[PDB]
Amino acid sequence: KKEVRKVRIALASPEKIRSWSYGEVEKPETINYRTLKPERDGLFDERIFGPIKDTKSIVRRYRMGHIELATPAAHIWFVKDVPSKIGT
């Protein structure tokens, strides 16, 4: 019910990644051309995101999962930045 009077930008912890994440996608299976349903828990699994059918798919468009890289990754910006924040 509160009206937004401020916005706040902050970094995210992978733990925080999970803090919202609705599971993880692990094999990139959009859909079979026969079966046009989200094939697996893949990049569009209904459960990870939400019911495709009417709460309708809005929750899908809002609920988000994560993907865990075995090898950690680096935010390209923080180095590619003209001042490479990490390198500085």
Partner 1 sequence: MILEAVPVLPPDLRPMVQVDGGRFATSDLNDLYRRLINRNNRLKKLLAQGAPEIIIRNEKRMLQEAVDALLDNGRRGAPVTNPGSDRPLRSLTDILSGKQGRFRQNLLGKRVDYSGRSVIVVGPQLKLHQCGLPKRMALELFKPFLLKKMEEKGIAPNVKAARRMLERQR
Partner 2 sequence: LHDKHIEIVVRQMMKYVEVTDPGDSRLLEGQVLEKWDVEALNERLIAEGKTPVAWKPLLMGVTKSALSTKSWLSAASFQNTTHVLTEAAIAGKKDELIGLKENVILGRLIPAGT
Partner 3 sequence: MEIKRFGRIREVIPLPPLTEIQVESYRRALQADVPPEKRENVGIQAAFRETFPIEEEDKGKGGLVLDFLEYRLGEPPFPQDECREKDLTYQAPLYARLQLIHKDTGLIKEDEVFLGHIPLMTEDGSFIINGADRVIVSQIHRSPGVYFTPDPARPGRYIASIIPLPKRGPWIDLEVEPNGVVSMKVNKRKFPLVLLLRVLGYDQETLARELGAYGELVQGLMDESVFAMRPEEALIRLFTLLRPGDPPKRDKAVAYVYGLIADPRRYDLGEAGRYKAEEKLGIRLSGRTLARFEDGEFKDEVFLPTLRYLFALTAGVPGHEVDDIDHLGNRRIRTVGELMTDQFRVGLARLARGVRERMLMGSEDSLTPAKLVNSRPLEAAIREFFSRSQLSQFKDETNPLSSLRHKRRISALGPGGLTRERAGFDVRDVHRTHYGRICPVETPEGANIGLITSLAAYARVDELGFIRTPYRRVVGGVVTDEVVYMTATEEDRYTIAQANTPLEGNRIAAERVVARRKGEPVIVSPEEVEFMDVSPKQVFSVNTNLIPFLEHDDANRALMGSNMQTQAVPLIRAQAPVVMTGLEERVVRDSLAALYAEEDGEVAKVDGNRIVVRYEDGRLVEYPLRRFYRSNQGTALDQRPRVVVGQRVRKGDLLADGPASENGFLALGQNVLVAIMPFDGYNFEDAIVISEELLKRDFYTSIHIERYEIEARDTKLGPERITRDIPHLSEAALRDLDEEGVVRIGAEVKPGDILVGRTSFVKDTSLRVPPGEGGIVVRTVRLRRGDPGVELKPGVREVVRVYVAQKRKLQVGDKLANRHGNKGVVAKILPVEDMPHLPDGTPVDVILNPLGVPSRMNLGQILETHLGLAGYFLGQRYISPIFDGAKEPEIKELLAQAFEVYFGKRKGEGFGVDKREVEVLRRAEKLGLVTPGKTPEEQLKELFLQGKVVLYDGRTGEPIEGPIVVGQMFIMKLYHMVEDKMHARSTGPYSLITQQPLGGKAQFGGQRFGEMEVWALEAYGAAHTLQEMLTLKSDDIEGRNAAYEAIIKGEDVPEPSVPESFRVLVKELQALALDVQTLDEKDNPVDIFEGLASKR
Q: Which residues bind partner 2 (CB under 8 A)?
A: 3-11, 77-78, 81-82, 85
Work out what residue 72 binds among partner 3, partner 1, partner 2, none; the CB cut-off runs from 5 to 8 Å by kind: partner 1
Q: What b/e readout covers 16-55, taking b as 16+ CB neighbours within 10 angstroms?
A: eeeeebbbebeeeeeeeeeeeebbbbebbbeebbbeeeee
Residues that bind partner 1 (CB under 8 A): 11, 14-15, 17-18, 20-21, 24-28, 30-31, 33, 36, 38, 43-44, 48-49, 57, 60-78, 80, 85-86
